[PDB]
Every structure is written in structure tokens, then in C-alpha cells.
Amino acid sequence: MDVLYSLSKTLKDARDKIVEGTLYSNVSDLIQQFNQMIITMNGNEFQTGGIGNLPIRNWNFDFGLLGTTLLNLDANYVETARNTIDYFVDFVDNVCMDEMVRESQRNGIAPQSDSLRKLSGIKFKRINFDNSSEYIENWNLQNRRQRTGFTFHKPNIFPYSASFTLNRSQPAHDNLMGTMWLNAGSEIQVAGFDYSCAINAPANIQQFEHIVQLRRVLTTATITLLPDAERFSFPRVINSADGATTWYFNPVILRPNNVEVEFLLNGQIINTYQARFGTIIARNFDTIRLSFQLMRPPNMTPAVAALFPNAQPFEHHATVGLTLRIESAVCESVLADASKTMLANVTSVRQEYAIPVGPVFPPGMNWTDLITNYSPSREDNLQRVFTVASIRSMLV
Amino acid sequence: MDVLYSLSKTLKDARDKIVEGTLYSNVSDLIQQFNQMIITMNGNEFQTGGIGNLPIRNWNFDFGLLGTTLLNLDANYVETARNTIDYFVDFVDNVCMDEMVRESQRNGIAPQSDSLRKLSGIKFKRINFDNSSEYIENWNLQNRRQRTGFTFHKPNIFPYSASFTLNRSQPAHDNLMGTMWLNAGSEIQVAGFDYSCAINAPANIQQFEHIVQLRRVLTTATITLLPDAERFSFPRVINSADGATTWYFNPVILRPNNVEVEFLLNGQIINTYQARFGTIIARNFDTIRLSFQLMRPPNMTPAVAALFPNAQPFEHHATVGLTLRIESAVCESVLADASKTMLANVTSVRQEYAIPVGPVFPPGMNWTDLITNYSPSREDNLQRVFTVASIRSMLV
Amino acid sequence: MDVLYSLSKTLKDARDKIVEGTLYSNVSDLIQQFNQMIITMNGNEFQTGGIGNLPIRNWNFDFGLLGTTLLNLDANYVETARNTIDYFVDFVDNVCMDEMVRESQRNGIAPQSDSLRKLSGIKFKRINFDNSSEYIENWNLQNRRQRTGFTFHKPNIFPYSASFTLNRSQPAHDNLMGTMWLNAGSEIQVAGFDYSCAINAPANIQQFEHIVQLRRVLTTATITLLPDAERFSFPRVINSADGATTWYFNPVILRPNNVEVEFLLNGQIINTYQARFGTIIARNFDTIRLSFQLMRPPNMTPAVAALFPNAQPFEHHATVGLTLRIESAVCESVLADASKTMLANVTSVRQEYAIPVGPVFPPGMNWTDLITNYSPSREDNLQRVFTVASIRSMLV
Amino acid sequence: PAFGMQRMHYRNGDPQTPFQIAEQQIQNFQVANWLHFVNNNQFRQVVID
Ligand SMILES: [Cl-]
Ligand SMILES: [Zn+2]
Ligand SMILES: [Zn+2]
Ligand SMILES: [Zn+2]
Ligand SMILES: [Zn+2]
């Protein structure tokens, strides 16, 4: 991985810096690194594989060194370098694609493609130089069992789940007490609905709880917490848990009461926010506990009193909602997020070459299924393919 | 462009690295590059401005080299370098502003301002060195007829459009079947509404389709697809298609049925997602087809059964929805997006200096009009001004 | 700050570049910078303080220089460098933490920790080298009183505020005219509601105006403006302004009329957008004025005409909306945003070590309180702690 | 001559020594490594007693 990354970084530097007219002193160190890469790679045969529809390709390296005598690079120098660079970049893209489409159960972190295994040999270790990208930096730290940090804008941490729980229910589904929630990528939209508006609740208060267990620990998380859930504030016709019938939801939104957000790590409370809305910071947690209350308003104007009778039928169902949005977080594990392209690139390569389902990832590289069962082997394989995809995106 | 970027990159490196106390070995190559810039620019007269309210400014370059030998940089060295850097940064800022305010229908990629046309001469090619930014790198890759790629967080690919189509309608607008949609930026909310709730539809199913054609192909696109459309789920008094009258919309949201998102390229299906929600990957597409069905619940509870009578009047209108958000994609062409400021920089420069509307862009650089008619000439001019704005951002 | 930043930058370069097999020419300049840092730090005693629960830590530097003898770095070289780097990273992280948890009312930009005060002595200026980070660049520009620039994706410029104003009201809350708004982070959602649907308005027009004062000037701002306000478009039961009773809101959403968005600087009009939706650019402003109108539809279909009677009672309250999202902007002051982790890091460090509330920041590092009262002293302290947080995040 | 390289055209007054240029130019590892050692073999200044 370090060698493949070093090849890609050398090629990117060569593409960006070996330009017409530039001072040779601008590229001297880069030219030394490039020539060392050429010397190391010359004479080696590589095969990029035939898994799926990805074609078998053979790579042969017999390239001249880049010159050193010029003071300013000219057209001839640039064209020679560009030919060598194009061949090498094609090779690196093919190697990255071959690695991205492969998975293993035991050593998923270890290289899987023939070319990358050959590059792991000692003779290529001299190619290795500056490992400054976040993904390769985390790769090196992971190899050494050191604390890793991946920064994510809007991490895709919650698997998709649009579910509801009913605590009070009847076959006619007309006096219902329960909770609705959408756990989207970085979004938790939850809402507790009481149809009687807590008319008979002790103290005229109905308690709602929602626990989301993150599959990985998040740190230094920026969270926007808003006091309403716009997803559960309009009338709906909703399937029953068994799907045998549909019930009606006609929410009217009340201000959530005793809003408590607890961010927990291994069951211990790390952060607690009572009646706080807007930006909050959850420094280290793997669990979110959102507790809120529907309080029947003790004083009601005539319209509000009309909405909430003292007994059935109940037509206007009192709903209290919270919205939680993780804008930024840090995870020790690779995750999909709204800003990067690693998952999309791995999926695109797997789809374009018809890679059959393997023994590690879910079919189609579906993120919900993957993150629901984000096992250590899946984490190893996913970090490998994400690092390879990041190395590939440097050139392609 | 490469020369202007090299000037700006040299100035930015000089600002960041030529600092009091630093080892001369930290800056030696940079000092040589800076001196080469000085040599190449010496004896040349430049003129910027003279369009709109952008003032005419003349630039004459007669600066000495930095030849002082030191182990560590001192204050004298820094102050000399700072004087030269300040003049050069002002010049580069003015050249960038001059190029950003200009357009041409023919050869809109080619330089438009006189200073940048002069800087395209062969004698200035010596200034050129490391071209590492995404925009200049894409510029060079395109000039080489190589496949370029701009990565976008939330690409502004959909021109603003809040429209509806009525497939069944009448002057009373009380028995309406059709669709309403908002396509804005990277978001598409669509909602198919049937007022009769598919009472008389064949098999009790009403099929809705929505085709959105992207003005440019997107690749490696991460999409969040959510079942409901919160924008079309509250009561709404909408205008008539001709504007003569107004009609009423009283949604009750049913879950969309047989949801099929097809990502198409040249009319062929590249990606298909059936009943899949959350994060999906569209690898390469120029069109999106959303097909969703309103299925009348076969089994209803009395509260539900009361909302959907057999015949008119229809008070509760059955609405199914979909939300599609492109979180990140890659486009070969330049686009506005949520994270970058190139469009905002160009618009700000044009507005601040009262640049008259030209023959390429819409007035005020309105993004909706620009992206609705994103012609090849418009694309060339936009890439030019965006590269210039990225070069300007490095210094200003 | 520049010295502490240079230390962290040297350590990061050493971690990324001192790797097995790498050419010595890849690292020669880095080795010289690192050895200069070792020489400068040798013989100096530091204490990182015991404020709150941060342990008092003593630091002694008696390290040997890194070797220059190898043509390619081997494993022994990497291990020796790793040991020295680990000690230095521990020191820099502790210094950054000790600086982040301190604040001053008199000179909050100046260093507060004793170690950062010692590192400001002239003897350490030799350490100083490339200052290329956005935050250190802004720090140096600010020290020279130059135009600073911080680029923010979704800047958290609006303090959280969910409020309403009733221009017309009565104790029964059934003929209400006014506005309700949520200002949160980078988003504004405003909604003007008239219960009589402007039946008795001077021209059947009800004017609504919302003025939002930004605590700091924003520039080069990309802003999405959308007609509806989904947050204020569902039935609600709302506390009265004095909390004595609760009123009922039953919105029906009409298209806002004569939508005029003004971006003002010093009360002067800078940007004006009339009936424009989608992406707009505000080049330089500190106030937003949103003027919209509930215009009674001159023509109504029977259902629409039935929603809005000529006199009380009113069951369907005519609401117009506006949504305004700041996707990207530039500010001369530091701000929390949806991408950067500075605020979260500072808050996490303050909570982890139970830092007692000080005389500058709100007593949780809570962002609503901070941005509401963004005083110059608060801005100075926040710029200091955010710069230190960025320096820390280079290593931790 | 051992490696068949063209005779070094060395300029008097060059910032680099001939061994430094040769180290940058020699592809054999043992020779290049000995050259690098020579190029960087220095006295260590140490205060003792
Ligand atoms: Cl976002
Ligand atoms: Zn974002
Ligand atoms: Zn049920
Ligand atoms: Zn119509
Ligand atoms: Zn009131």
C-alpha cells in the first residue's frame, strides 16, 4: 500500500511539476525520486487480473531515466516524461482497480491482488516516500496499532431505518401512543406521538425515549439539535407492523418537553444536554439517547382545547419531535460521508466490471447492509479498498 | 493560465515560507523560483482594468534578485522579499480581476485580458512551475486532451424549478392526478398526488414518473434517496398552470410503492435501484428517472377508510413522494457547489465593478439561467473564470 | 503561535516523510529543519500547566540529532526518529491543550500558557518555517493587520433562535397576523401567517419583513433561497409570548408574493434579489432583510374559496414562507462551521479536563451564547484557541 | 568508467562536490551508499569535560 501510494504520489508530482520551462531546481528531488522508481520498476513484469469483466493486462517496465543536465525543462523533456508518466499512471490505476474489487475474510487488510503483493516485496521498498495523505497516514498508523483519525463531514454512520414503535395500540389504531424515527445517513429524526395528548397520563406527561447505537465510536462530533421533526409533522397513512392493515396519523406539533440528549460511550454518559438546541459538541460516544416529553398544555385557548378532547375519538394527535444532524465527526474507522468519494469509486469499479459478490461485503456494496454488520473483517477490507481508492483518485 | 497560476503559487509559497528565522535550506528552491520569476517579469509593462468601473492600472517590473547568503532568514531578508511580494500580489490580483470580468463567444477558453494574453507568450514560460491545484491540474489535463475531473460536494447541477404537471384535471381542480416537483441545486423533491386515491385506477395503482435531464454527465455520484417529500406534504393553495385561478392541495402521505430510481446514460440504464433507500451510488449518468406508484391500501382502518371515499368530493388527497440528494459527484465540466466560492468570487467581482452584461453569461451571473443554457461556449468561459478565481483565491 | 505551529508542522513532515526505504534526498531539507528544531529546543525546560484536571507535565529536551549518513532510510533510522518524534508530539499536544483551556479579557490574542509564552522568545525563532495552513496564514496576516480570510462551508453565523412576532393578536388567538422564524447555524426559515388571509388588508396584501443582523460581516457568500418554509407549514400548538396559554396554528401555504431579499452593509443596500430563487451570491453584507407578502388570490376555485371565509372563524391560516441557507461564505473572523472541527476540539478538551468557566467564554463553550455576544475579546480568544486547535489537529 | 558512464564534466566552482553529483548519478547501491557516507561524514562537535 505504501509502495502503491508512493508510486501514485510520484506520478502526481511529476504530472504537476514537470512542466515546460520550469527550473530544473524545482524538480530535482522529484526527478531523483522518479528515476529511483524507474530503476526499481525496470525489468519487472506485472499482471493486473481478470476478476469479473476487468481485463487481464500485462505490464513491462523498461524505461530510460529522466535527464538531469537541463537548467529549464523544454518540450522534449516534458514529452519524454509524459510518455513514461502515462504508462505508469495507467499501470497504477489498473493495480488500484484490481485491488479495489477483491476481498478476503482472514487477512482483509493484507494485499489481495498479484501486483500489489509483488509490490509488497522488499525490492520495491525503496520507492516509498512522503506519506502525507490522510488515508495513507491512517494506514501507517493502523499498521503500528496507533490511534487513527478520520475526519468526516456528515458521516454516514446510521444505517437507513424508517421504523415506528407503538407502546399503546388497538386493532382499530385510533388511540395510539408510540414513536416514529428516520435514521438516515447523519440524521436522526424522531417523534413521539400520543393520540389522547396525555389526557390520562400520570401528571399529564408522556415520556418518549429513542436510543441509537452507533456501530463505531465518534469523537469531536459537531451536532445540530433542533426541537422539531419535519418528517413526522404531516398526515400519513402507515402500514401496520405486520402489514395487514393501515392506520392514520394526523399530527399536531407541540414543543418537546424535558429534551435530554445523552451521548454515551460503552454505557457511561459522556455528554449531557438539557433543553439545548443548535450546535452541541459530543466529544466521544457510541450511543445517543434522546429522551423527550409530550406535556399536555395546562392552559389552552378554545381552538387548542377543541383539538384535544377528554376521550375518544381523537382526531388531532399530539406529536413532539427532535432532529439530530451530525455535521462533523472523527472516527477511528473509515466511513462513507457526504464529501468524499471512496465508497462511490469502489462501488463504481465493482459495478462497471461486474464483480460477483464476495465473502466479505454485501452485494452491490450497499452501505446500509455494510454498516449494519460492520464487522472487523469488513472494516479491514473496507479500509484497504478505501485507501486504494484514495490512491487511485490522486491520478484518476 | 499556467503562467498566472505559477506567479500566484510562487507568491503564495514566498508568503508562507520566507519568514523570519527559517533555515535558508527551507527556501533555497523557492528562492530560485522567485528569482526566476523576477528575471522573467523584468522589463515588461502590463496594463489591467479599463472595463466597467475596474480602474486602469499600469505595472512596471524592475526588481532585483535575492542573492544574500544566510543560514537563517532575518528581518532584512523578509522585508525585501515582502516588498517584492506585495507588488507582485497586487499585480496578480488585478490580472485575475481583469480576466474574471471578461468573456467571448468565440475561443472563450483562450485568454481575454491583454495582460494574460501577453503572459501567454513564450518568454514567460520560464515562470511556470508546480501546477498542483485541482482547477489548474484540470486545465492542463484538458489542454492535453485527457479526461479531467472536478469533484463536487453537493453539485449545483439542477437549475431551480418548482413546477407541477396535472395528468387528470378539470376547471374546478377538485379531482386532480399528477406530480409536483422542486429541482434545486443538488436536491430533487418529487410528489405524485391522486385526489381519488386510485379508487378507479387499474389494479388500484397510480403510476407516476419524473425524468430529470442533467446538463452534464455526473460520475461517482453519492445519492441519498428518501421515501417522502417533505416539501409537498402540507396544505397548499397552488396557482393554476396559466395563472387564472388557484387550486387546493391537502396531502395525506402514503409510502411510495414500486420505487425505481434509474440512472441513465444516453438513454441506457446504467444504475437501477428498486425499493432501496439511503445511500446509493450512480457511477455514470446524464439522466435520472424516478418511477413511483401510489398503491391504494388494500386493508384500511376506519380512520383511514374514511379519508378515501368512493367518489367526489375528495378532501384528503393521496400523495406519494421521493427525495433525491446528490451529496457528492464528479463532473468533467465546472459547476457551482456547496463548498466552493469560485462562482461567488466571479459574481462578486462583476457586481463590485459594475461589469456590463456580456454576450456569454446571463445578467448577474445567475446560476439558474447559466446552467439551464450551459452551452459549450458558456462552459469554456466559465472554466476560464473559475480557474482565474481559484488562482486569485490563493492570494486574495 | 508561529513557533508552535512550526514545531507541529516539522513533526507532521517527519511522520509523513521519514519512512523505511526513502531516499535521503526526499528528506534532506526536512532532516535539516528537524535538527534545527532539536538544537533550538535542547536544554530548555517547559512546564505544561495544571489548570482544571490537565496534569502538570515537565518537559526536558536532550535529544541527539537525526543522522545524515544513509542513502536510503532503514528501519533503525525510522525507529530512532520515531522515538524523538513521539516525545516532541507529546510536548506539542500538551502545549496546545494548555493554551486552549486558557483565556484572557485584556489580551486574548496573546499567548496564555507559560510554554507558549516561552516559545515566543527570540531564541526559538530559528524553528519557524513554512506557514502554509489557512489558520496560521490568517494569524500572520492579522499580526500584520492585513485582510484576513476564513472560508466556511455552512458557517454557523446565526445564533439559535426559534421565535415569533404577532403584529395582530387577541387573548383567544384566532385572528393572528405576524411571523415565526427559526435562525439556526447557516439556515433561516421565516414564515408570515395571516389568519384572515388579508381579507381586510389595504390591497389584499399582507406585508411581512424579517431582519437578521449577522454578528460579523460575511463576504463571497453562496446562498440558497427557496420559497417555502417547511418548518412552519404543519399544525402546531404554540406557547403564548408570556407562556400563560397556548394557541393553535393551522397553516395553509401560499406562494410568497413580491419576494425581496436584501443584503445590507452599514444599512446600505449591497445585494438585491427580487423573485429570484435557487443560488444567489451576496458579495459583502452584515444584515439580511427578507420582505415577502401574503397576497390574497384574486381568483379561487371552490375549495380554495372555502378555505378562506370573509370573517371569523378562520380554520386555515394563510402562511407564506422563505428558506435561506448559507452554503459557503468568507468571514474575517473565525467561526464554527459544518466542516471544520476547531470548536469541537476546543470544547472536547475543555470538557475532558473540567476547565472552570472563565471570564471570556460561555460556561460550556456553547456556541449560541458565544456567537450572540461575539465581542472583540471573545473573537481574539477564539482565534487563538482555534489556531491552537488546528495546530493540535495536525498531530492529534 | 566501471559503470560505463560518460566522463563527468565537472565545473570548477560547482556548489556540489564531484562525489555528490556522482551519488545522484550512480545506480549501484553499494557505491552510491559509500558515496553518500563520504558526502556526509562530518565531525561531531561535542563539549567533553
Ligand atoms: Cl452539507
Ligand atoms: Zn456539506
Ligand atoms: Zn399498528
Ligand atoms: Zn390547473
Ligand atoms: Zn399570544
Tab-separated table of N, CA, C and O in Angstrom, chain C residues 132-164:
chain	number	residue	atom	x	y	z
C	132	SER	N	1.885	27.513	5.980
C	132	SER	CA	1.003	27.360	4.837
C	132	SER	C	-0.436	27.027	5.207
C	132	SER	O	-1.289	26.993	4.316
C	133	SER	N	-0.732	26.770	6.478
C	133	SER	CA	-2.099	26.460	6.868
C	133	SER	C	-2.964	27.713	6.823
C	133	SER	O	-2.490	28.834	7.013
C	134	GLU	N	-4.254	27.506	6.570
C	134	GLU	CA	-5.178	28.628	6.481
C	134	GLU	C	-5.215	29.411	7.787
C	134	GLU	O	-5.220	30.647	7.781
C	135	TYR	N	-5.213	28.707	8.918
C	135	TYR	CA	-5.316	29.382	10.205
C	135	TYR	C	-4.022	30.096	10.577
C	135	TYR	O	-4.060	31.214	11.096
C	136	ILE	N	-2.864	29.484	10.317
C	136	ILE	CA	-1.611	30.180	10.595
C	136	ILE	C	-1.411	31.327	9.610
C	136	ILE	O	-0.872	32.380	9.966
C	137	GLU	N	-1.834	31.143	8.358
C	137	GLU	CA	-1.759	32.233	7.392
C	137	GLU	C	-2.590	33.418	7.858
C	137	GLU	O	-2.140	34.569	7.809
C	138	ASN	N	-3.809	33.148	8.326
C	138	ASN	CA	-4.651	34.214	8.849
C	138	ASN	C	-4.041	34.830	10.097
C	138	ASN	O	-4.126	36.041	10.299
C	139	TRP	N	-3.426	34.011	10.947
C	139	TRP	CA	-2.774	34.528	12.143
C	139	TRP	C	-1.671	35.519	11.781
C	139	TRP	O	-1.608	36.626	12.330
C	140	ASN	N	-0.803	35.143	10.839
C	140	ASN	CA	0.279	36.032	10.428
C	140	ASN	C	-0.257	37.283	9.743
C	140	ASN	O	0.256	38.384	9.970
C	141	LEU	N	-1.277	37.141	8.895
C	141	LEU	CA	-1.856	38.314	8.247
C	141	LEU	C	-2.470	39.260	9.267
C	141	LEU	O	-2.330	40.481	9.159
C	142	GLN	N	-3.157	38.708	10.264
C	142	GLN	CA	-3.762	39.519	11.310
C	142	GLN	C	-2.702	40.229	12.137
C	142	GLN	O	-2.893	41.377	12.549
C	143	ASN	N	-1.581	39.554	12.406
C	143	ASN	CA	-0.489	40.198	13.130
C	143	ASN	C	0.053	41.398	12.367
C	143	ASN	O	0.556	42.345	12.978
C	144	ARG	N	-0.028	41.372	11.041
C	144	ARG	CA	0.414	42.475	10.201
C	144	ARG	C	-0.725	43.411	9.822
C	144	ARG	O	-0.520	44.329	9.023
C	145	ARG	N	-1.917	43.198	10.374
C	145	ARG	CA	-3.095	43.989	10.039
C	145	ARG	C	-3.327	43.989	8.530
C	145	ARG	O	-3.428	45.029	7.880
C	146	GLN	N	-3.394	42.791	7.970
C	146	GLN	CA	-3.753	42.583	6.581
C	146	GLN	C	-5.135	41.952	6.514
C	146	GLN	O	-5.633	41.393	7.493
C	147	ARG	N	-5.756	42.055	5.342
C	147	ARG	CA	-7.086	41.498	5.146
C	147	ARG	C	-7.054	39.991	5.355
C	147	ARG	O	-6.484	39.257	4.544
C	148	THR	N	-7.659	39.524	6.437
C	148	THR	CA	-7.730	38.102	6.728
C	148	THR	C	-8.904	37.475	5.986
C	148	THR	O	-9.845	38.153	5.575
C	149	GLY	N	-8.830	36.164	5.799
C	149	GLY	CA	-9.938	35.448	5.205
C	149	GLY	C	-10.086	34.032	5.709
C	149	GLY	O	-9.184	33.208	5.550
C	150	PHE	N	-11.237	33.731	6.293
C	150	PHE	CA	-11.602	32.378	6.681
C	150	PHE	C	-12.776	31.934	5.820
C	150	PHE	O	-13.809	32.606	5.786
C	151	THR	N	-12.612	30.815	5.125
C	151	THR	CA	-13.634	30.274	4.240
C	151	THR	C	-14.420	29.204	4.987
C	151	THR	O	-13.831	28.290	5.571
C	152	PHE	N	-15.744	29.326	4.976
C	152	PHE	CA	-16.619	28.479	5.774
C	152	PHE	C	-17.665	27.823	4.889
C	152	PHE	O	-18.376	28.508	4.148
C	153	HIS	N	-17.761	26.502	4.986
C	153	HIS	CA	-18.856	25.744	4.399
C	153	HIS	C	-19.970	25.652	5.432
C	153	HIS	O	-19.793	25.037	6.487
C	154	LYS	N	-21.109	26.267	5.131
C	154	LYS	CA	-22.222	26.360	6.069
C	154	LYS	C	-21.765	27.002	7.372
C	154	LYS	O	-21.758	26.345	8.419
C	155	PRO	N	-21.375	28.274	7.349
C	155	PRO	CA	-20.946	28.934	8.586
C	155	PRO	C	-22.066	29.014	9.614
C	155	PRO	O	-23.207	29.346	9.295
C	156	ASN	N	-21.713	28.744	10.870
C	156	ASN	CA	-22.652	28.840	11.986
C	156	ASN	C	-22.675	30.284	12.489
C	156	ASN	O	-22.184	30.623	13.566
C	157	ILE	N	-23.264	31.151	11.669
C	157	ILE	CA	-23.261	32.580	11.960
C	157	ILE	C	-24.517	33.037	12.695
C	157	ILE	O	-24.487	34.087	13.352
C	158	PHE	N	-25.615	32.287	12.608
C	158	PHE	CA	-26.857	32.670	13.264
C	158	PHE	C	-26.955	31.979	14.612
C	158	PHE	O	-26.930	30.742	14.653
C	159	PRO	N	-27.054	32.700	15.729
C	159	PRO	CA	-27.349	32.025	16.995
C	159	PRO	C	-28.731	31.393	16.956
C	159	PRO	O	-29.660	31.920	16.339
C	160	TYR	N	-28.862	30.251	17.623
C	160	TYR	CA	-30.135	29.548	17.623
C	160	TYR	C	-31.231	30.436	18.199
C	160	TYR	O	-31.112	30.951	19.314
C	161	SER	N	-32.312	30.599	17.441
C	161	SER	CA	-33.439	31.401	17.908
C	161	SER	C	-34.690	30.936	17.178
C	161	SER	O	-34.798	31.114	15.961
C	162	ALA	N	-35.616	30.335	17.915
C	162	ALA	CA	-36.934	29.963	17.404
C	162	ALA	C	-37.947	30.861	18.106
C	162	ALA	O	-38.304	30.625	19.263
C	163	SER	N	-38.396	31.900	17.407
C	163	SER	CA	-39.248	32.922	17.991
C	163	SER	C	-40.350	33.289	17.007
C	163	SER	O	-40.319	32.914	15.834
C	164	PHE	N	-41.340	34.024	17.505
C	164	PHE	CA	-42.425	34.526	16.678
C	164	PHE	C	-42.754	35.948	17.097
C	164	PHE	O	-42.530	36.340	18.244
